[PDB]
Ligand binder design. Structure first.
Ligand SMILES: Nc1ncnc2c1ncn2[C@@H]1O[C@H](COP(=O)(O)OP(=O)(O)O)[C@@H](O)[C@H]1O
Ligand SMILES: Nc1ncnc2c1ncn2[C@@H]1O[C@H](COP(=O)(O)OP(=O)(O)O)[C@@H](O)[C@H]1O
Ligand SMILES: [Mg+2]
Lengths: 302, 352, 496, 78, 331
């Protein structure tokens, strides 16, 4: 696990920063090229890398899915890119205007929706910045440069407080303030100043996504038992990993300061984990058989 | 004894972890106080400088200035006033027997970072002056610990101040200087002629006996009653300037008021030769000592007006400050040592 | 033919005699700039005999640059004797404010000015290499002087920041000074966590050179997020200028822009405050703003701002300011030309352009009032050396070398960093290679490539490597402590 | 004096242009000068008119938004 | 100046998480470096020792040796090389502008547990020499990373090494301690005379043995050395310019001597008897003895180098203890 840390970190960082505005085919091709570059310069990476499996926990995945996120892997990866953008202000290009509901569900009542066409835009934006509310600004194709210093994060640190010059006056920022920008026009004119500094994330639907969704639908209505079983083993393996970690912490606490029962339970849990891994090793590649079976439907659909 | 000049090499070299910002000298013992970019306050012995006599961390940010004072009550002890970027000022007591810093108190009330502190005693009363980036010069009482006066003398943030009796001269980032009467709080005069923000400003006091001095003597009995002839300033335009202070409308037993025709500084002398921002200035005897960001220290004459001595490549990085013993004070003996502190995490002391 | 110039009716031109003024020949330019260099070298009488080779070298350089970098490559490759005049002015300005000079120092100074005048508008790397070879050939042909060093763009660092005179400063000392000044700048002004590389230092030097000239305006063209606005603000802070950035948002028209310009002009004249006005390509929304900028740049005033009562109160303020300094001026012409002299002396306009392919920026560059006055500096996109320097300065603070590494045997031209010895060099090379591949396969064309992706990827990689190494070390320590405790317990059991 | 924008080194082309310019204005004829953007029309022109004892200058720099009011006002002061 | 007599009582009582494995001193700052048994590296202020300045989990196992050297040539910085039982030689730098540890690189390649490390600087090149339990010593490169050569100095496991110039002296588990050349990699002499394994063996630099003995010894630069064994005695050697001589017989310790350090004429050594004694090199007798310094035994001792003109020999030394405490002696 240690010998393939830098390569996986390189892949994840490049996937976050570069691939937010690409469709499935371009993401796959660029990831293949990145893996080739990693292999050329003698950097070892996980040969079974998956971005969701590396940066998205199951708790966060279910939290996103229950908030209104689609079940697509592309949308899951896009949401992972969105919520891991701590520095750059995320830009969400959604023609369906759906991710507003997802972010509002994620942040609850803290979410305040502003627009670039409102008259009281600047004053309520300053109030939100001072309070610390999570702002979502719709109509991203009409970006107003008056808030440009919020995009570039060019604050000034007055002693123990942090301030930003908005409009014609300096207003305090808060540690919990977050900014999202949302757009619905895929052909909108994003200014180069904005486009160069935002984490542009595309929640669009493409023909490669048509092939992927055709496979997903024929999987979930043709043989849904296999997908349900895969979800069951994934959840069971994650829960048993957490249980093993908790029991290991309890065993270490007992050893530092009964013991035989704890050791027997730990051995039984380890044997169960080994059996679950042995069962899952013979089930996952059969899903690839379905990929080898439902390619013609995707080709005909596209 | 006032004609002492440091030699071409430092007498001792002091290594500290970070960039030295302020250095002071103990007016009675060979002890050097060094405040650096972590806010760490150090007390070093001159004859044993391998390890500090004391080292205390009191500020969470960089210390911007220092000033020391030996109290003269009609017990005697040393007060250290350290100001930093954490918006506060800290007042320490020096204990000679313990050789350890014993913090007396702290002063709060500055909205933004504080850049200079000056402490003076008039007659059984010690006051602490300070200037900060919120453009307000504030003076507290040392004993009471509460603020006595605050006033904004400048449009932009003030950088250095000086105290002499009941008059304060202040330089600021708006490349202008201003003399105000502290009890009245009214700007006695303003001065322009620098083109860059002012690093240090201090008064040029009087001296009793000398063969001849041009900048430290009164030209008339009116100036003798006034008590101050000129002032010296240094700024980021690589220049030092000696300004004549004009006189305001003075009344006996009354608050002075500025003179509309005599309320503007007159630039008497302009000393040039530094290659970068002149950081600190200091006057001992007839000589004026200065340092700049050119890794050098220059010694000028007040009479002739040209640079007698240059100490080049004194530090690897910039030179941040000097300290020399006060010559015009009767109670402070002007001993023969000069200490400098630079950005290369180092300090130097020239002795004998 | 060129844009901006409109075809004219023959009914009017039939009444005026049409005279064509062509470019002066080689001999005429050689004579003119021989006279100019004699006027310059009256300052340094010991080199009075080198006026003819310097003028011949300047004229040959102008001819070769006009012939090589034609308009067919880029639309802004227009050369004229105005470039030679600017070369003469720059050589005089640097000789006047410099130390005692030698022949090698004079040749290097002339080469530096030629770099800053004839070759700041060049876009391609091959064009800059061609210009460097052209400088070598010109110096060898006309000034056969030995012991002359590298004449590249980064090996000619002439600056007056480190001293009292315009001399050639050492690279390391200048870099250290720039780092310290930028730390102070970030402390006193806005905080931007920048990385000091050699191209940054060179660009700082040329912006400082242009901002020190009387009526010295700028036109910085390059990719987005290459450090144009921030270096302009830092350099103007170094020189003591006051930065004015027009806060032109979408709900703005000519009233707000004209108010900003009038306030800047009033501050420049009535208060004698030097102003650096940073005009961005996004501030000029309509063509009328560009016409106002052309009026301000070609002339030294905007007459449309001051008319009627505004003009009368402007003249009253002008008379008051003139009487403040005690100058005997009474006529309106004296007040007006003193006013426009003060504006031409105390105002510097810096133009920031991010997408020169765009039609608005093409009208910006092709505008005659801007092209013939603003000094064009094509910063462009980062090359592999600047990217390697930034990446090495960004990944040197993160724990990366922890596992075994075998040095790869790859081709020589596939490595942009210094030859690979560790994992950090390989990581930097991988990031640069993927940036190039990504920008190649998105079909960007000849558009500038912003390095924002590269910097964001470097920062994300640093943070992720830090977090992952922390987690890995914590887990390894946990399992090792547990294994040691288990071994101790089993040893105690076996002992008893 | 190299920083003076009005200075002109007298070459043979400049004298030829000045002579034909004087001959053309002495014939009561308007003049249009044309050429490349750095040819020297303005400099030769201002040198010819400034160094003449017979002709004065009323200079107008035309722009995109130019009216006859500017020309009339510029004539008004002379 | 260099004849400082340490006080009979400690000045600063630094408390660590576990038993101290090795201590080191900042060459120009009052900052100590403390290594724990968990591999964590500790930095303490000698005037505010209540809270550590910076703690980083360097190694997963216990640290076996460490050394520091302020570079002097490219801004100069402190270099900390740390080796442990994980067959890994971590390298760290201590930034003073932030007061924290920065990981530079790890030197890997040893197939067994590392024994000791030493850092010496050339005119412009920095090198690190580390020896493992596989009876092999590898010469590392600070900037590059890979090794220069590998040589076997002894048939048994080696536990200590010291570098002074182009010659390196290594002390193995067997009593036949030998000195080998770094670039040449050829053994010159091997000497025995002890009945227990050697715990520390380092050169004696010129400042009875502090001066060169002959013209050949002065030209060579090495005249004598002192080694510590587990036989509760201190033995002073004399390396020839092929069998070393033995004329010095100093003893007195009740347990095995762990580490020694030469500071001028006076020599200070630590043992496992929970006591500290200063034995003069001239008289060969213990003058100052410290009792009840710590509950456990003493693991290592560190003193300022008096052989370097660029290092100030301050009157401050620290000794490591196995009782989860560190002793600091000031003035
Ligand atoms: N060493 C560097 N040189 C240039 N730009 C840098 C460097 N390091 C970071 N940057 C990026 O440059 C940006 C600031 O550049 P700026 O001048 O605002 O761009 P623009 O040219 O679009 O105005 C920062 O957001 C930062 O990400
Ligand atoms: N005889 C000459 N003497 C001096 N400079 C000349 C001469 N001929 C041409 N020049 C140069 O040619 C340039 C032409 O500038 P200018 O007259 O403004 O061009 P235009 O008339 O096309 O606007 C000037 O900068 C000037 O320095
Ligand atoms: Mg023209």
């Amino acid at each position: 696990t240690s010998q393939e840390l830098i390569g996986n970190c390189i892949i994840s960082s490049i996937y976050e920063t570069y691939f937010g505005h690409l469709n499935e085919r371009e993401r796959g091709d660029m990831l293949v090229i990145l893996k080739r570059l990693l292999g050329k310069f003698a950097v070892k990476y996980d040969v079974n890398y998956r971005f969701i499996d590396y940066l998205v926990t199951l708790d966060e995945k279910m939290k996103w899915l229950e908030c209104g996120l689609d079940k697509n892997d592309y949308f899951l990866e896009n949401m992972s890119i969105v919520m891991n953008s701590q520095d750059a202000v995320p830009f969400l290009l959604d023609p369906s205007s759906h991710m507003i509901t997802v972010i509002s569900n994620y942040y609850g009542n803290k979410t305040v929706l502003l627009s670039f066409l409102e008259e009281g835009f600047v004053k309520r934006l300053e109030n939100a910045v001072r309070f610390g509310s999570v702002v979502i600004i719709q109509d991203g194709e009409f970006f107003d440069p008056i808030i440009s210093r919020l995009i570039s994060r060019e604050f000034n640190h007055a002693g123990n407080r942090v301030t930003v010059e908005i409009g014609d006056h300096e207003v305090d920022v808060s540690g919990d303030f977050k900014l999202f920008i949302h757009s619905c026009d895929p052909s909108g004119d994003i200014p180069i100043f904005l486009r160069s500094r935002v984490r542009l994330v595309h929640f669009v639907t493409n023909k490669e996504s048509i092939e992927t969704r055709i496979f997903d639908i024929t999987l979930t209505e043709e043989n849904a038992e296999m997908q349900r079983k895969r979800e069951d083993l994934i959840k069971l393996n994650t829960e048993y990993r957490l249980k093993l970690k908790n029991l290991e912490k309890r065993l270490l606490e007992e050893l530092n300061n009964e013991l035989m029962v704890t050791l027997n339970n730990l051995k039984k849990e380890a044997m169960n984990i080994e059996k679950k891994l042995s069962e899952s090793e013979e089930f996952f590649p059969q899903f690839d058989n379905l990929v080898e079976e439902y390619s013609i439907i995707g080709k005909h659909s596209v | 004894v006032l004609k002492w000049i440091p030699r071409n090499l430092p007498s001792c070299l002091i290594n500290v972890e970070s960039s030295v910002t302020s250095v002071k000298l103990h007016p009675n013992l060979p002890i050097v106080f060094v405040a650096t970019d972590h806010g760490k306050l150090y007390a070093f012995d001159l004859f044993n400088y391998t390890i500090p006599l004391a080292s205390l961390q009191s500020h969470t940010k960089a210390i911007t200035s220092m000033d020391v004072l030996f109290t003269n009550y009609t017990k005697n002890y040393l007060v250290i006033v350290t100001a930093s970027k954490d918006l506060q000022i800290h007042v320490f007591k020096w204990v000679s027997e313990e050789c350890k810093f014993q913090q007396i108190r702290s002063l709060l009330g500055h909205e933004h970072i504080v850049s200079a502190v000056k402490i003076w005693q008039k007659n059984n009363d010690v006051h602490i002056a300070s200037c900060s980036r919120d453009q307000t010069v504030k003076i507290w009482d040392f004993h009471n610990g509460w603020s006595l006066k605050t006033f904004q003398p400048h449009s932009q943030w003030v950088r250095s101040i000086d105290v002499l009796g009941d008059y304060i001269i202040s330089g600021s980032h708006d490349t202008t200087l201003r003399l105000t009467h502290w009890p009245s709080g009214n700007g006695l005069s303003v001065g322009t002629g620098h083109e860059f923000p002012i690093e240090k400003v201090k008064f040029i006091h009087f001296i009793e006996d000398s063969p001849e001095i041009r900048f430290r003597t009164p030209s008339t009995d009116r100036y003798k009653n006034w008590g101050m002839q000129y002032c010296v300033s240094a700024s980021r335009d690589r220049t030092i300037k000696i300004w004549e202070i004009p006189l305001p409308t003075l009344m006996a037993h009354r608050a002075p008021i500025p003179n509309p025709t005599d309320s503007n500084f007159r630039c008497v002398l302009t000393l040039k030769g530094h290659l970068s921002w002149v950081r600190d200035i200091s006057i001992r005897g007839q000589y004026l000592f200065s340092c700049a960001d050119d890794k050098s220290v220059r010694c000028w004459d007040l009479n002739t007006g040209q640079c007698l001595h240059v100490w080049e490549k004194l530090h690897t990085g910039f030179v941040n400050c000097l300290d020399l013993d006060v010559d015009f004070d009767s109670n402070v003996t002007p001993r023969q040592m000069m200490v400098t502190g630079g950005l290369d995490c180092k300090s130097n002391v020239f002795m004998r | 033919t060129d844009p901006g110039r409109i075809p004219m009716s023959e009914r009017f031109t039939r009444h005026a005699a049409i005279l064509y003024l062509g470019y002066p020949s080689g001999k005429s330019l050689s004579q003119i700039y021989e006279i100019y260099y004699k006027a310059i070298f009256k300052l340094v009488p010991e080199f009075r005999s080198y006026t003819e080779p310097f003028a011949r070298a300047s004229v040959h350089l102008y001819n070769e640059c006009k012939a090589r970098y034609s308009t067919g490559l880029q639309s802004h490759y227009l050369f004229s004797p105005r470039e030679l005049t600017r070369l003469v002015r720059g050589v005089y300005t640097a000789i006047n404010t410099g130390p005692r000079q030698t022949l090698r120092s004079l040749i290097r100074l002339w080469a530096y000015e030629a770099w800053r005048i004839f070759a700041d508008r060049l876009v391609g790397v091959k064009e800059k290499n061609s210009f460097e070879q052209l400088l070598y050939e010109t110096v060898d042909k006309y000034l056969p002087n030995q012991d002359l060093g590298n004449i590249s763009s980064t090996s000619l660092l002439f600056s007056g920041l480190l001293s009292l005179d315009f001399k050639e400063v050492n690279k390391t000392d200048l870099v250290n000074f720039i780092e310290e000044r930028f730390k102070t700048f970030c402390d006193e002004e806005l905080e931007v966590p920048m990385v000091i590389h050699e191209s940054m230092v060179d660009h700082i030097l040329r912006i400082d050179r242009a901002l020190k000239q009387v009526q010295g305006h700028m036109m910085l063209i390059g990719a987005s997020r290459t450090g144009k606005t921030i270096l302009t603000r830092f350099v103007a802070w170094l020189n003591g200028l006051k930065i004015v950035q027009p806060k032109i948002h979408r709900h703005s028209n000519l009233s707000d822009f004209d108010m900003i310009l009038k306030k800047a002009i009033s501050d420049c004249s009535l208060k004698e405050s030097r102003t650096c006005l940073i005009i961005d390509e996004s501030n000029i929304l309509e063509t009328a703003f560009l016409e106002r900028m052309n009026t301000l740049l070609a002339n030294a005033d905007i007459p449309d701002l001051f008319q009627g009562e505004e003009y009368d109160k402007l003249l009253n303020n002008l008379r008051n300011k003139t009487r403040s300094l005690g100058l005997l001026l009474d006529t309106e012409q004296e007040l007006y030309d003193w006013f426009v002299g003060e504006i031409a002396k105390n105002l510097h306009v810096v133009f920031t352009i991010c997408d020169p392919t765009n039609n608005k920026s093409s009208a910006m560059i092709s505008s005659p009032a801007l092209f013939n006055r603003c000094i064009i500096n094509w910063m462009g996109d980062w090359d592999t050396k600047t990217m390697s320097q930034v990446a090495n300065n960004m990944v040197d603070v993160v724990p990366m070398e922890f596992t075994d590494f075998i040095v790869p045997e790859v081709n020589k031209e596939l490595v942009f960093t210094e030859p690979i010895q560790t994992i950090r060099d390989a990581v930097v090379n991988i990031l640069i290679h993927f940036d190039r591949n990504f920008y190649q396969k998105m079909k960007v064309g000849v558009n500038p490539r912003s390095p924002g992706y590269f910097i964001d990827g470097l920062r994300a990689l640093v943070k992720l490597v830090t977090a992952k190494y922390q987690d890995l070390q914590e887990n390894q320590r946990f399992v090792n402590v547990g294994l040691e405790k288990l071994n101790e317990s089993v040893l105690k059991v076996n002992e008893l | 004096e190299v920083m003076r924008p009005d200075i002109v080194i007298p070459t043979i082309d400049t004298i030829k242009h000045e002579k034909i310019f004087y001959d053309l204005l002495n014939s009561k004829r308007g003049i249009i000068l044309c050429g490349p953007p750095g040819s020297g029309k303005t400099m030769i022109m201002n040198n010819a008119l400034r160094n003449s004892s017979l002709y004065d200058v009323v200079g107008i720099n035309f722009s995109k938004d130019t009216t006859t009011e500017h020309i009339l006002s510029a004539l008004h002061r002379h």
